Amino acid sequence: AMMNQDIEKVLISEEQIQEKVLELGAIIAEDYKNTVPLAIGVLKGAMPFMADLLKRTDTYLEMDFMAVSSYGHSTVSTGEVKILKDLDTSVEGRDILIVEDIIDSGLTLSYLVDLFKYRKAKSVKIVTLLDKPTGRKVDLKADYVGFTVPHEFVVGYGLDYKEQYRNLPYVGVLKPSVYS
Amino acid sequence: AMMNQDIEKVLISEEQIQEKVLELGAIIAEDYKNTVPLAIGVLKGAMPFMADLLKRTDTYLEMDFMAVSSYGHSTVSTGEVKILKDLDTSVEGRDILIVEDIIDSGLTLSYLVDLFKYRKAKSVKIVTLLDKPTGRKVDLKADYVGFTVPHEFVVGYGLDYKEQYRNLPYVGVLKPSVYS
Amino acid sequence: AMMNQDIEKVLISEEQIQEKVLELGAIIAEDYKNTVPLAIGVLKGAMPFMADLLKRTDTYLEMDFMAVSSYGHSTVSTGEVKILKDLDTSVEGRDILIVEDIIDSGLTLSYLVDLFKYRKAKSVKIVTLLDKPTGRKVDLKADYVGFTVPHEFVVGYGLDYKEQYRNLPYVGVLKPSVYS
Amino acid sequence: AMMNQDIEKVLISEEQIQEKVLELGAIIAEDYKNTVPLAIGVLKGAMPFMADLLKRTDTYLEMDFMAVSSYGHSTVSTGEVKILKDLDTSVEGRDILIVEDIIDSGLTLSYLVDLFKYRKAKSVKIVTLLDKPTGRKVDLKADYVGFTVPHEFVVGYGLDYKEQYRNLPYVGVLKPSVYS
Ligand SMILES: Nc1nc2c(ncn2[C@@H]2O[C@H](COP(=O)(O)OP(=O)(O)O)[C@@H](OP(=O)(O)OP(=O)(O)O)[C@H]2O)c(=O)[nH]1
Ligand SMILES: Nc1nc2c(ncn2[C@@H]2O[C@H](COP(=O)(O)OP(=O)(O)O)[C@@H](OP(=O)(O)OP(=O)(O)O)[C@H]2O)c(=O)[nH]1
Ligand SMILES: Nc1nc2c(ncn2[C@@H]2O[C@H](COP(=O)(O)OP(=O)(O)O)[C@@H](OP(=O)(O)OP(=O)(O)O)[C@H]2O)c(=O)[nH]1
Ligand SMILES: Nc1nc2c(ncn2[C@@H]2O[C@H](COP(=O)(O)OP(=O)(O)O)[C@@H](OP(=O)(O)OP(=O)(O)O)[C@H]2O)c(=O)[nH]1
Ligand SMILES: [Mg+2]
Ligand SMILES: [Mg+2]
Ligand SMILES: [Mg+2]
Ligand SMILES: [Mg+2]
């Protein structure tokens, strides 16, 4: 019983992830050299990428995190979600950088973006490791993108199937037999 | 030995409060007869008034509550507050009735008002037991008001000094010897 | 369309509730005359009763509130729940009084009781408006009880059916046709 | 202009951290091969270490997180803290692995340890990257330790001074001129 045996194929190895993280980190450090931004991750999936990205971003910055959950029907259509943990600091006047593992529908993330704008953020940018424009249900594009990927359910490096596989150091596609 | 000894004068007796609450309840019941509104109280102070008001509001309605805290000096400027407990249901398409004990500066309350408007509320109205408009730091008008009271620090019927005196059935003014 | 028309029969009218609230309040005020207890309500159902009870409790006290939600299978068997809003003050050394609308299974409430004991409460007592020893799934008895009632689903005065009827000023039994 | 100029000395380089993390990950993967543990990080500081550790832990596991804050002077005594974000799943019957960046006083961590034991955890173990046992205000031993470090205030790899320097890929000591 080993996780590797559940993966049909690899999409992005650890080597390529760390390479792209090094690239995005250096770009972000230069873009944010004249401000102390508030970098925000949405639990749970964004944590591994956010960890590796920010330690390749050589500039002063603060971290924070938010936890949200679905309301049921309203979340599936407008992205409105229940805030379980709000930010530990105010958004007003801050340059916000949202760090995400993947953008698929974009519903929830667009709700948070405009929420931070309602809270009078100085700016709101997005950096995502993976982008799936296929399943997009609102006009939302990330400012920084590590990889664009097909509409195929992947796992690893923060992305789960029923709360497991988040700890893989790579991203891959599960064998169809894994699903249940 | 007893709280009444700390009270210098009674500003609004229990009898007066229940008379106006009976009045407000009937008005609100008429205004919301063709909708199932979401009646929201902001902890902790609004709890006694919200309880007695909806007891007098003979119409179908749901209850919910929110808890917030300040970000320090940031809240004092725009009223932005940390959400500790969001609503249990979505705001979109709902008629929101915010139940408050008192509106003084209005900073925090206006922030929640436009938060719910950002969340696509069908309508957002405010009913407060006490209105202290002389303290406003923002333009915010309550739609339903029990009493308008002078620019003074009161206590009782939800309103606390250092977390005490909320359980008084009336609204009064403390003797200056109490402040420390 | 009026709520009264949905009630098959009344269990406790408003007059009897306020009478019992006056009785329990005076008992609690004497028992807690030599301490400033922390009175805690569990949202949402306990709010109306907690409001009326504490304003008939003529002694110094503090209020607080907690919000919890179910985990699924673990909540149905052991009462363990997710804390959505924790207390705003520490429990250590405090005399805790939990104010509840009804005790049926007792699972959740016994989890919170022993949680406060784990947090080194000086004492943990319970006051409940209604008690249904029928559906009890753990040995838990309230210290103060307003009314013992049969194993029949009631509504009003904080108790809901699908989030409605909480605002009734009395407790009654819905007509069977109301259910869906 | 750059953070490295604020650092007086590097205590544990990035290369050393990843070597030990690789070691810890393999050990933990062996110890948890016959269970699906719940790996819990305490925000914010544990995020970088937790990310790299589970990347090296080739076994099935779930991730979760908690957020807390202090009650003022009360936390300093028994470590009791306000829960801002509880776990997303129940603790009962689960093998809990708490992932920490550093253990200094141990007050807060011991409180969470016995909280999870109160919630009927099957087991509760602790892995910390850094151990500062000379600062203990309670008897708490970590089961897995990366490095033991002297009684000194460090920064980097999750550890902050006034919310900054978390994003350093190493652990260092600030120049005294930085403290204000
Ligand atoms: N494993 C995996 N997950 C995907 C994929 N695409 C989207 N998700 C996740 O599914 C959840 C719901 O996503 P959607 O709302 O449909 O799309 P969105 O990501 O654009 O919002 C999100 O987080 P969540 O799962 O609700 O939270 P968490 O897992 O981040 O804690 C998202 O991260 C994928 O290809 N693989
Ligand atoms: N006792 C008392 N309180 C007043 C009075 N006027 C305002 N407050 C309360 O003080 C807190 C902050 O007041 P302001 O910022 O000045 O006014 P605002 O609430 O309208 O913004 C609010 O709640 P809070 O105290 O932060 O929350 P909670 O106590 O409801 O939990 C508000 O309800 C008064 O005359 N007497
Ligand atoms: N209307 C009504 N409700 C009852 C009755 N008996 C129990 N409940 C409610 O159902 C929910 C689950 O109760 P149980 O866990 O089965 O029993 P317990 O009350 O002893 O814990 C509780 O709150 P909750 O509904 O989950 O939260 P909230 O409604 O207090 O927000 C409780 O208040 C009843 O006769 N009538
Ligand atoms: N930078 C740094 N921090 C240390 C050091 N030792 C302890 N801390 C952090 O300070 C906070 C309180 O520390 P103590 O109460 O003294 O030690 P304890 O965490 O073991 O109880 C904790 O997290 P926190 O800061 O309150 O939370 P967060 O920063 O993880 O969000 C802890 O992680 C150190 O040498 N350097
Ligand atoms: Mg997931
Ligand atoms: Mg107050
Ligand atoms: Mg209910
Ligand atoms: Mg810190």
Numbering used by the authors:
A (entry chain B), B (entry chain A), C (entry chain B), D (entry chain A): 0 to 179
Task: Tell me, in the authors' exact words, what the paper reports.
HPRT is a purine salvage enzyme that converts purine bases and PRPP to GMP and IMP, which are precursors of the essential nucleotide GTP. HPRT activity was previously found to be inhibited by (p)ppGpp in several bacteria including Bacillus subtilis. To examine the molecular determinants underlying (p)ppGpp regulation of HPRT, we turned to Hpt-1 from the pathogenic bacterium B. anthracis, which pppGpp competitively inhibits similarly to B. subtilis HPRT. We crystallized Hpt-1 with and without ppGpp, and for comparison, we also crystallized Hpt-1 with its two substrates, PRPP and the non-reactive guanine analog 9-deazaguanine.
The HPRT-ppGpp complex diffracted to 2.1 Å resolution with two molecules in the asymmetric unit, and each monomer contained one ppGpp coordinated with Mg2+, in agreement with near 1:1 stoichiometry measured via ITC. These crystals formed in drops containing pppGpp, but there was insufficient density to completely model the 5′ γ-phosphate. Although it is possible that the γ-phosphate was hydrolyzed during crystallization, the presence of waters and unassigned density around the 5′ phosphates allow for the possibility that the γ-phosphate is present but dynamic. With the phosphates of ppGpp spread across the binding pocket, the HPRT-ppGpp interaction represents an elongated conformation. The 3′ phosphates of ppGpp are coordinated by backbone amides of loop I, the side chain of Arg165, and the Mg2+ ion. In the HPRT-ppGpp complex, one side of loop II faces the active site while the other side is a critical part of the interface between two HPRT dimers. We applied PISA analysis (‘Protein interfaces, surfaces, and assemblies’ service at European Bioinformatics Institute) to predict that this dimer-dimer interaction results in a tetrameric HPRT.
